Amino acid sequence: AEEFPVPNGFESAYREVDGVKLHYVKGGQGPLVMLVHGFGQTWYEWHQLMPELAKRFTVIAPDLPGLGQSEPPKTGYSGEQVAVYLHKLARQFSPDRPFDLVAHDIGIWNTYPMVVKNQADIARLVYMEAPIPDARIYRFPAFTAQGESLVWAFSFFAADDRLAETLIAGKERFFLEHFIKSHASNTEVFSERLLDLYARSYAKPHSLNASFEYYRALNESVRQNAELAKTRLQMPTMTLAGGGHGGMGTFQLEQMKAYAEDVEGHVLPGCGHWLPEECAAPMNRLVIDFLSR
Template sequence: MPYQLDSGFTHNMIDLDDVRLHYVRGGSGPTVVLLHGWGSTWYMWRRVMASLAENYTVIVPDLRGIGDSGMPQKPLTGYDKVTVAGDIHQLVERLGLGPVHIIGHDHGAAVAYAYSATYRDEVRSLVFCEMALMGVAGDKGIEYFMDQREELRLWHLSFHAANHVAEMLIHGKEREYLRWFYRMQIVNVDAIDDEDIDVYARSYAGPGGLRLEYYRAFYQDGIDNKRLAQQKLTIPVLAVGGANSIRDLCVSSMEAVADDVEGVVVPECGHWLPEERPEAFLENVTAFLQRV
């Protein structure tokens, strides 16, 4: 049965200075912004949005160039995390919301860090899920996963960063590639079923839909992160990893850039945390939000 958006939420479009963003909104109270990563859209938060909206205004955008954002013309540039964070900040400003609690997964976590470090007075807390920062965490950063010398790590990071090659090889097989991509990094295999894959494939198979520029921006992200990390975050930070995925490397990244870091490793969980273990996600995140 196709997913039905909860009646308390609405789909919206907004024209910003140089990009059009799609976002979902619901609830009332202090603002929580949920940012997805690559291979996902706003839809990845579907199992946790309603619970968060009981106490918070929940804003769930599609990042620049992904999902319904940027339609009908996807931006060709601007996929470094500082620029994408600027999109989200402008969205929050236009909606008259903030300061915010910002929660990110994968690339969305890197965007959430860039937002927190750039707009320091406008962020209440940061939840950093299933990501390692480029440029600042030494052998525990993204570079660790891109190093293929000792063992097979996350080879797709280098593959996606190869300019135009990945698009050429994936084109026409986006659904098959995404299905493999989810299965490669998942423990609870029922968490992303065929209907869910159809939702994601419709986004990523569209013109310009792969948006692998997020990976090609890693090296600029590293430069930006080194600059931003010169002043550590002082807001509360929760770093959450899956036991069968990044584990405590989220904490290592955050400890390199923030003073007040709490770490959680969710058992029996792969990369797709809010979809695989929504109850554990909500338990840890709502307790954290209540404390801060």
């Protein structure tokens, strides 16, 4: 069974990593690039970018532990813990060469530690649409002069007593449409059909819970990154962020500069949080050109 349609010429497979079975979609030939999705989604967010990338690279797009068709982690959900799974996965397919990394949203939280701890394993890096967990997250506002703020949901998801699962179970489809669209500038790309696909996946009880566990581990990740960030990233990096409603704007690049010696950043106008879907053409182009240098 596949929760989402595999692109022609790609395979859907699984690999056991430290006792956890990870689902991934793989295709193409050449140097490895790993694409890591974020909250509310799965590998499928990369499905339009993958075919073009696979013309030049071996592309692998895993489901984060607990999400999509991947089993929950056995250690925990903090960035440093989850990153081990992803680093090892990538190294199964690129054991003797560095690989490229593209990550979106909590894909960042779940990769940063393995990047900083194995810098020689990472050739080039693309980060989009989310803060690296650090003290800056504590400065985002709970409420804005426009209405709901960008990250109030962090508290919702992190709340005790399984507040979020309890309220959202049975209403996953409704909640996800609200969440995704409220964070979008080009909301029209989120058809009822596409939303059905994403909602069916995260409605799996272990997936709904795993979604929130990432946020419940966020403060732990912040504490981990406080130690880890004493060494800057040395490889070429690019940040992308949406300039429209729901996007991170200049924050993405400004924070990344504290983390990387070599970074070029882009803000995409009229695009919100969901770059691969809201603004496929310019995002795809930026990523492909960057990785193809």
